[PDB]
Amino acid sequence: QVQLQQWGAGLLKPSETLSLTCALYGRSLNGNYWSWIRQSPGKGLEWIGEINHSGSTYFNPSFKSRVAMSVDTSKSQFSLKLNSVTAADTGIYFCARGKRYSASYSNYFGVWGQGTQVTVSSASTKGPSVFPLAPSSKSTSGGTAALGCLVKDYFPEPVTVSWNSGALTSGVHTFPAVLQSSGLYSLSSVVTVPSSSLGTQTYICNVNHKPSNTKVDKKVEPK
């Protein structure tokens, strides 16, 4: 039942400050240091620094000129600030449980937050358009039909797609997002289903673009 949940703004312009918070459930912060770790496509996994329940900190020297961390024990929360961001700070940022006071050499990471995607860009937030990929006879095969949703023209990442409010998971493929020539992302989510069901089953793609607070429920019907 021990878990870390994190949040914070994921679109920043260059020179702005990154601010993230992590919340711990199922135990208190006492007894461990708590770390921030990021992952970028070009530099891989990088440890940023750590803090304990008393607010003592130690930072990777590569970040010491720009980083701050704080802790609020009354909320079992801890925070990261990274000043003066550049494109080199785009990446996925994770909080994690680190070393235990009871063991000097124990700074591996056994519990992690879910990650926050941070994009440093001049481009503005934009929510997606959602269009049906309608099943047809040009989309059927030996009793199997394919259908989907095109999630187009949004920024930044990420978007989440579910089907039928989460009730439909078998046969779903949600493609990695790709940047279009416009500079906006697009992806499709598809699912294969019995062609026997097109007759009678409702298929809804539920799209959530949290960066723009956009939600769309698109019904996908044969044309």
Binding site: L45, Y105, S139, V178, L187, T192
Partner: protein, 217 residues
């Protein structure tokens, strides 16, 4: 700092195969080494710490090895018999000083050839009101990953106006899926009739074409 070098960059193996991945520290780190598994879109999960101790919940097919000496620099992660859910990138990390990670090893699964099922989708009327038309070609549940997808409009080969995306390898059946998306202006879409995607793949004896005609029942 102490730097970690992982080898190989990528590894392909079949289900049931033994797998070895290695990590070298730039100076001695004793047993202060952890191994992680990461799936796309998720946090890493620890597999091994103290170089050879399995973490809770980790299946017995994973093991960690080193020479057992305080001077150790060289470490191995072994999967005795690979399972389909093991497709992932694997990372080492030392904690002899400031934590540092290796660059990762991407583990891919080899399986039998599977031809794609091919589907084509016309643009929606809703989208056409915006001035653009997207046409989507889906290649579903195939292996290996390499495929060629060519678009034709009224049988004229298209270049420069399509993009592809490929899924992560499936953790149950080890297949890939692929989307190819053709972007046209509404005017260009309305002026032409036949829209076709042509797919070449190892599992197809000859290329498959899926097509539709704009405005057909």
């Amino acid at each position: 700092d102490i730097q970690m070098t992982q080898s190989p960059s990528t590894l392909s193996a079949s289900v049931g195969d033994r797998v070895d991945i290695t990590c070298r520290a730039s100076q001695s780190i004793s047993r202060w080494l952890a191994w992680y598994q990461q799936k796309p879109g998720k946090a890493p999960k620890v597999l091994i710490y103290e170089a050879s101790l399995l973490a809770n919940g980790v299946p017995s097919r994973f093991s960690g090895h080193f020479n057992g000496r305080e001077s150790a620099t060289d470490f191995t992660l072994t999967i005795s018999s690979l399972q389909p859910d093991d497709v992932a990138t694997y990372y080492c990390q030392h904690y002899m000083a400031d934590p540092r990670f290796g660059q990762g090893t991407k583990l891919e699964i080899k399986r039998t050839v599977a031809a794609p099922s091919v589907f084509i989708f016309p643009p929606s009327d809703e989208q056409l009101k915006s001035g653009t038309a997207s046409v989507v070609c889906l290649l579903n549940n195939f292996y290996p990953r390499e495929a060629k997808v060519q678009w034709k409009v009224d049988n004229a080969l298209q270049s420069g106006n399509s993009q592809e995306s490929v899924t992560e390898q499936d953790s149950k059946d080890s297949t890939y899926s692929l989307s190819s998306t053709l972007t046209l202006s509404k005017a260009d879409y309305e002026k032409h009739k036949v829209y076709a995607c042509e797919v070449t793949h190892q599992g197809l004896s000859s290329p498959v074409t899926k097509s539709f005609n704009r405005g057909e029942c």
